[PDB]
Write a protein that holds these residues in place. Structure first.
Motif, short mmCIF file in Angstrom:
data_model
loop_
_atom_site.label_atom_id
_atom_site.label_comp_id
_atom_site.label_asym_id
_atom_site.label_seq_id
_atom_site.Cartn_x
_atom_site.Cartn_y
_atom_site.Cartn_z
N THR A 53 0.82 -1.21 0.00
CA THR A 53 0.00 0.00 0.00
C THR A 53 0.85 1.26 0.00
O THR A 53 0.42 2.30 -0.51
CB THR A 53 -0.94 0.00 1.21
OG1 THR A 53 -0.16 -0.10 2.41
CG2 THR A 53 -1.89 -1.17 1.14
N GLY A 54 2.06 1.20 0.56
CA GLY A 54 2.91 2.35 0.71
C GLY A 54 2.89 2.98 2.09
O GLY A 54 3.69 3.89 2.34
N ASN A 55 2.01 2.53 2.97
CA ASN A 55 1.88 3.02 4.34
C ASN A 55 1.85 1.86 5.31
O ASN A 55 1.05 1.83 6.25
CB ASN A 55 0.63 3.88 4.51
CG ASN A 55 0.69 5.17 3.72
OD1 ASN A 55 0.92 6.24 4.27
ND2 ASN A 55 0.46 5.08 2.41
N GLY A 56 2.72 0.88 5.11
CA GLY A 56 2.62 -0.37 5.85
C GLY A 56 3.16 -0.40 7.26
O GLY A 56 2.39 -0.50 8.21
N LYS A 57 4.48 -0.29 7.42
CA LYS A 57 5.06 -0.58 8.72
C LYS A 57 4.94 0.62 9.66
O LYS A 57 4.24 0.54 10.68
CB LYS A 57 6.53 -0.98 8.57
CG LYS A 57 7.19 -1.38 9.87
CD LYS A 57 8.62 -1.83 9.67
CE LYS A 57 9.54 -0.66 9.43
NZ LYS A 57 10.96 -1.06 9.38
N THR A 58 5.58 1.73 9.32
CA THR A 58 5.59 2.90 10.18
C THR A 58 4.38 3.80 9.97
O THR A 58 4.24 4.80 10.68
CB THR A 58 6.87 3.70 9.96
OG1 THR A 58 7.08 3.90 8.56
CG2 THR A 58 8.06 2.95 10.53
N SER A 59 3.52 3.47 9.01
CA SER A 59 2.26 4.18 8.78
C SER A 59 2.47 5.66 8.48
O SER A 59 1.64 6.50 8.84
CB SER A 59 1.30 4.00 9.96
OG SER A 59 1.21 2.63 10.33
N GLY A 60 3.57 5.99 7.82
CA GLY A 60 3.85 7.35 7.39
C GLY A 60 4.50 8.24 8.42
O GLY A 60 4.70 9.43 8.14
N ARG A 61 4.85 7.72 9.60
CA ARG A 61 5.37 8.55 10.68
C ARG A 61 6.88 8.74 10.64
O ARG A 61 7.37 9.77 11.10
CB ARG A 61 4.98 7.96 12.03
CG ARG A 61 3.60 8.34 12.52
CD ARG A 61 3.39 7.85 13.94
NE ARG A 61 2.00 7.93 14.37
CZ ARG A 61 1.53 8.84 15.21
NH1 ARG A 61 2.31 9.77 15.73
NH2 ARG A 61 0.24 8.81 15.54
N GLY A 62 7.63 7.77 10.12
CA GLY A 62 9.08 7.87 10.13
C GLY A 62 9.76 6.93 11.11
O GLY A 62 9.26 5.84 11.37
N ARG A 67 5.53 8.80 18.22
CA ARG A 67 4.92 8.10 19.34
C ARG A 67 3.42 8.37 19.38
O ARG A 67 2.93 9.37 18.85
CB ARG A 67 5.56 8.52 20.66
CG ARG A 67 7.08 8.66 20.63
CD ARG A 67 7.78 7.32 20.84
NE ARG A 67 9.22 7.44 20.62
CZ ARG A 67 10.06 6.42 20.57
NH1 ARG A 67 9.65 5.17 20.72
NH2 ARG A 67 11.35 6.66 20.36
N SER A 68 2.70 7.46 20.03
CA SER A 68 1.28 7.67 20.27
C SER A 68 1.09 8.77 21.30
O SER A 68 1.78 8.79 22.33
CB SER A 68 0.64 6.37 20.74
OG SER A 68 -0.74 6.56 21.03
#
Lengths: 100, 48, 116, 143, 111, 50
Positions: free
Chosen positions: B24-33, B40-41
């Motif tokens: 999808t392109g937003n898999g592991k880090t979900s776009g955060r870096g 962090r949450s």
RNA sequence: GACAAUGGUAGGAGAGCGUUCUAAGGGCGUUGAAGCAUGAUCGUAAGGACAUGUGGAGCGCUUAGAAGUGAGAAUGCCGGUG
RNA sequence: UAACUUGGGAGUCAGAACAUGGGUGAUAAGGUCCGUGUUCGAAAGGGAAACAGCCCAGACCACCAGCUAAGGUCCCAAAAU
RNA sequence: ACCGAUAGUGAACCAGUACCGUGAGGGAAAGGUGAAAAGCACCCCGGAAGGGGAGUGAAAUAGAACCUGAAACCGUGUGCUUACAAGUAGUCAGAGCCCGUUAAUGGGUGAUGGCGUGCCUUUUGUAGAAUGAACCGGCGAGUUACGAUUUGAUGCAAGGUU
């Protein structure tokens, strides 16, 4: 006897009555085809040379117009989340030689 | 008719879902870096 | 509504295990180990499709060298002589002629020597 | 796909005899290795054996160049702690001339399963007489 | 024609039974009885009753003679496991598996 | 020491090539007619010859 | 028809597959649904059919709608088995 | 064949080797700190035996077709004993 | 346009129960024969459990440990191959020996030759002797409410909207 013919990119060694596989042509199934480019003829008859034999055509008839077996293309890079998957079926044209 | 419905052209769009595989392109880090205060949450610094 | 699994995870895992038949030991039984080997098989086959063309050109040239030496000349001077004449026959066809038609090859070695 | 492949149904092998008198050790060993493998045939196939048999007579009076008679040394280890042996090439010629030729040629062949079988077709004798008269060996001149 | 008998849920470990089954596989019925009676293993008398039950099935249920019979098949299958515990040192307990097997014997007249 | 790797089923079965038991070593009793151990008495009629 | 472009991590943009439920329309099923198993089948990918065994009562298709909507890894939690 | 302007969304602030111009050290360091190019990072393929950073060269897919670069042509090992 | 037995209340079942603690207190696992018990009279091996027939039933591989019955793992029998060989176990080439398909330039096995040091995470840089995973299965992570801004669509327009 036999001849060497150039069927586009590659060369084939053909006899009479032999069935061969080539890349897709513009002909239909059943009609006749002519190979206008022949590079060498041997056998008992006098050997002819090159670059092109003056005339000396070869005739064949089209049997089937199909595609090859599917091969799966797959690559990946380790520790980098990158990978690709592709299918492929290569079309061919079947012929039978009948008159050199 | 109720069995042939159609929204207007260009009026709808599908939402984006993160954390659903690498293709999808937003898999592991979900776009955060990678490994920061903004990764962090609970977020980071105040808007000002 | 609640969406559960079932009949989707099993289906795609069986596809991978079914591509690994013939593998040794647990590499055709367990999904995680089989999944790794199937990826390496695809990587190997991509590389080997392009190495197969370098492997067969070498074989033809080796056979042309042996046939030419029987006529008191080497491979390097044979290809120069044919080029200076314009035979335009590739290595695949010259190899098939030397194996089968012994005296047809001698018809091509002469013209390669005529042009020096 | 037109390429011919040779297999055991149609392989033909023959016997040769080569004289090792007055020749350099390495210049003769390189030529013999090209024959045991089958590099001189038009039906050479990489994964099957095609080469012929070679008999080497007069293994003595094999000639070196320079000071190799005393300078060239062969080492071996017996895999025991502190055991390494040594022998001079001029000393092996007069006590085991067959091993001197045999090891030199075997160093020029690939070390695969087929390479060991292809190296078992070499017979080396120190004199001018050989016992392989049941076959019909042919004289071979070096290129 | 074949006859068979089954013993189910026998409280003996499956891989201790299989050692005895390797000797009588393929022997005549009269020879297999003697081997089982003279082998000094725990599971020999248990397998003895299964072969005797199958021999008597070939005489009453079917019409077969016990002089031309052979042992066609003899295998063991796993059953349910009984789970127990053993108190070890320092206040820890270790699990113990009391295993169980199914035993099947088939005797054939031939053909 | 502890095992470094899991032992596969191929290696486990190779090690059990020689793990098995032998034949009792029996002969026929020529008074009983039934089988008995060599150099041991018969158990049917309890006779021992020789 | 002629020409041109198409290696790729963080990250931006676009087009799609599949899963559970709802609405409308149209269908299949004891002359055998779903599920399970095997197969030498189809598509560029996610994936979709067909035939044969088991099974004994429900289930697909088209267009829309809404989500507890996709698992290989957290000394992850629970059960079974080496 | 790009550049500038206005809006929506980011990641980055641990870099390394080679050549070259300098400081520091001892005209030591696979040392350290700046200026200028390249490659890796995020780049597979050929050469240097093996060898992220050196030389050649940028993989859309299929073919048992041809010409070349670096580097090579006695045998392993393709091509000049 | 809520769940369907790892879900839904901790508890669909004799659950605040078994159990654990001096005490306050903490806390599970466990549903399903068949339409109808019509729940296998009788014979055979055995001390018994268990089984082979005969009967019931549409069906007993529906026999109460009972609807369907996957994977790990454990066994029996068989086509091809293996006891001179240095293996991230595959890929490309390839004889020999057996079979016959969703019928198509088919399926199973593999004497030999070329190439080839797992996956993830974290790093300037990992085959790494840096981290994590014994195996299989189920479960397990960007959501909603109320405001702001920007983009697309639709209605009206010096007016638009409750």
């Amino acid at each position: 006897m036999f001849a060497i013919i150039e069927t586009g990119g590659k060369q084939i060694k053909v006899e009479e009555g032999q069935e061969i596989f080539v890349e897709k042509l513009d002909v239909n199934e059943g009609d006749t085809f002519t190979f206008d480019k022949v590079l060498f003829v041997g056998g008992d008859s006098v050997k002819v040379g090159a670059p092109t034999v003056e005339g000396a055509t070869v005739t064949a008839t089209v049997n089937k117009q199909g595609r090859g077996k599917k091969i799966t293309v797959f690559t990946y890079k380790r520790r980098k989340n990158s990978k690709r998957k592709k299918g492929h079926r290569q079309p061919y044209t079947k012929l039978t030689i009948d008159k050199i | 008719k109720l069995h042939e419905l159609k929204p207007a052209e260009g009026s709808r769009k599908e939402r984006n879902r993160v954390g659903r595989g690498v293709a999808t392109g937003n898999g592991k880090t979900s776009g955060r870096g990678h490994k920061g205060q903004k990764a962090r949450s609970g977020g980071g610094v105040r808007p000002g | 509504p609640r969406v559960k699994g079932g009949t989707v995870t099993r289906a795609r895992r069986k596809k991978t295990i079914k591509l690994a038949k013939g593998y040794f030991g647990s590499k055709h039984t367990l999904y995680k180990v089989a999944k790794q080997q199937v990826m390496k098989s695809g990587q190997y086959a991509f590389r080997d499709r392009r190495q197969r063309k370098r492997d067969f050109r070498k074989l033809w040239i080796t056979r042309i060298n042996a046939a030419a030496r029987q006529h008191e000349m080497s491979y390097s001077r044979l290809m120069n002589g044919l080029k200076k004449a314009g035979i335009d026959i590739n290595r695949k066809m010259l190899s098939e002629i030397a194996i089968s038609d012994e005296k047809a090859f001698a018809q091509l070695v002469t013209k390669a020597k005529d042009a020096l | 796909r037109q390429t011919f492949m040779a297999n055991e149904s149609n392989i033909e092998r023959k016997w040769y005899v080569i004289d090792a008198e007055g020749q350099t050790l390495g210049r003769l060993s390189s030529e013999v290795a090209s024959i045991l493998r089958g590099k001189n045939k038009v039906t050479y196939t990489p994964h099957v054996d095609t080469g012929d048999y070679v008999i080497v007579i007069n293994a003595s009076k094999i000639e070196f160049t320079g000071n190799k008679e005393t300078d060239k040394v062969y080492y071996r280890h017996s895999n025991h702690p502190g055991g390494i042996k040594s022998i001079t090439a001029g000393e092996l010629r007069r006590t085991n001339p067959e091993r001197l030729i045999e090891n030199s040629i075997k160093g020029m062949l690939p070390s695969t399963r087929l390479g060991e079988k292809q190296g078992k077709k070499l017979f080396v004798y120190g004199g001018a007489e050989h016992p392989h008269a049941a076959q019909q060996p042919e004289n071979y001149e070096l290129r | 024609m074949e006859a068979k008998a089954v013993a189910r849920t026998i409280r003996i470990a499956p891989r201790k039974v299989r050692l005895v089954l390797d000797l009588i596989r393929g022997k005549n019925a009269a020879e297999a009885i003697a081997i089982l009676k003279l082998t000094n293993k725990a599971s020999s008398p248990v397998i003895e009753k299964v072969l005797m039950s199958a021999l008597a099935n070939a005489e009453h249920n079917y019409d077969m003679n016990t002089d031309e019979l052979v042992v066609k098949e003899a295998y063991a299958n796993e059953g349910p496991t009984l789970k127990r515990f053993r108190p070890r040192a320092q206040g820890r307990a270790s699990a113990i598996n009391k295993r169980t097997s199914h035993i099947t014997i088939v005797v054939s007249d031939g053909k | 020491a502890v095992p470094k790797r899991r032992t596969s089923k191929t290696r486990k079965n190779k090690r059990r090539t020689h793990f098995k038991i032998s034949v009792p070593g029996m002969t026929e009793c020529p008074n009983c007619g039934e089988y008995k151990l060599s150099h041991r008495v018969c158990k049917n009629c309890g006779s021992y010859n020789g």
